[PDB]
Design a protein around this ligand. Sequence first.
Ligand SMILES: Nc1nccc(-c2c(-c3ccc(F)cc3)ncn2C2CCNCC2)n1
Ligand SMILES: NS(=O)(=O)c1ccc(N2C(=O)CCC2=O)nc1
Ligand SMILES: NS(=O)(=O)c1ccc(N2C(=O)CCC2=O)nc1
Ligand SMILES: [Ca+2]
Ligand SMILES: [Ca+2]
Ligand SMILES: [Ca+2]
Length: 348
Amino acid sequence: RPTFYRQELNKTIWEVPERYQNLSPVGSGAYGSVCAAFDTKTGHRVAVKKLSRPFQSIIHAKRTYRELRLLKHMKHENVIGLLDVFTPARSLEEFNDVYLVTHLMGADLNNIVKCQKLTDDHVQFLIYQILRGLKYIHSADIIHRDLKPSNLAVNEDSELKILDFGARHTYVATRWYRAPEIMLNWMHYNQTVDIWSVGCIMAELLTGRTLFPGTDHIDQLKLILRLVGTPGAELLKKISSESARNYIQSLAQMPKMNFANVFIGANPLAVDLLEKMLVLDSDKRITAAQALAHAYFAQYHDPDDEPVADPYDQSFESRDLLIDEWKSLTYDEVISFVPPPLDQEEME
Ligand SMILES: Nc1nccc(-c2c(-c3ccc(F)cc3)ncn2C2CCNCC2)n1
Ligand SMILES: NS(=O)(=O)c1ccc(N2C(=O)CCC2=O)nc1
Ligand SMILES: NS(=O)(=O)c1ccc(N2C(=O)CCC2=O)nc1
Ligand SMILES: [Ca+2]
Ligand SMILES: [Ca+2]
Ligand SMILES: [Ca+2]
């Protein structure tokens, strides 16, 4: 058994194996907080997330299980996955803390390294990586639902990973990148909710400005309609609230803008891709796999290196179990974790 040590980080005691050294805080994550660390076994830099009160309630307990299951399944170069998972507990009866370990990424997309402005080739690379990660998670029936720059971890070489993907049950989050069907609680939607978000992110990389910086959900909707035009009646089918439908229907009709008049001087291929992503008709929205084939990414696209995921069993999501049952299932997942090899890639 490894020796653990205690260190106060973010005003609370972390208990970590001697393997991980020089911890220092690098911000909060979903339901936890994160430290950079040095892995003395491999000489690699890692990020360690300590979950916050993982078994305090039935909500925390199931979300702890959910996150550990999800991260144990994610094995893709543009998606956060696990190098390690640990607990100081020596038995289930002692088990009350969960730490997740992944490769250290320096920043998020808001902090991407650049020289004055991003070149189009660099924007291609950033968006390509998001879409490659989305193809993978979508193939396992996992949707992000809140994709945005702060949920894209980026390192010093602009390599990018999606994180905080895939909550059922209830900090002020930005809504500027959320798909309309999510922000307004429409009755149904598909995996292309995340493609809307990609469009919002890519637009901002091209212009340097937020695409839809609404002050509230009505202001944001108005900004959206000014770009994409007034929807048809069929879209009202998706909206439960009569007051919301009546309001939208009452708005003065707006024409769709030609995106070439909006993203001035952009690569025409970038404009065309944005036209395919920023669609209110989510059944006409391009999918991640389709976007990867778009000519905008021609210099990066490689079908042999755009894999899909193994099947992911989410049957647990429909189940209500007791707190100690989720805790025991989580403990099982900690104990059964098998670390990946340090080098899992080979030349093409
Ligand atoms: N610096 C860095 N590097 C990799 C990941 C993270 C990370 C994690 C996280 C997730 C799982 C895991 F096992 C370990 C860490 N959760 C939030 N973040 C950060 C993402 C960038 N903004 C600050 C929080 N942070
Ligand atoms: N990879 S490790 O060497 O840092 C490590 C960390 C923690 C642990 N551990 C647990 O998770 C439960 C009991 C225990 O000993 N084992 C190895
Ligand atoms: N906010 S804006 O309308 O002034 C604006 C700013 C920047 C841009 N743009 C460029 O300069 C290169 C590509 C692109 O889209 N377009 C519009
Ligand atoms: Ca290749
Ligand atoms: Ca190799
Ligand atoms: Ca090949």
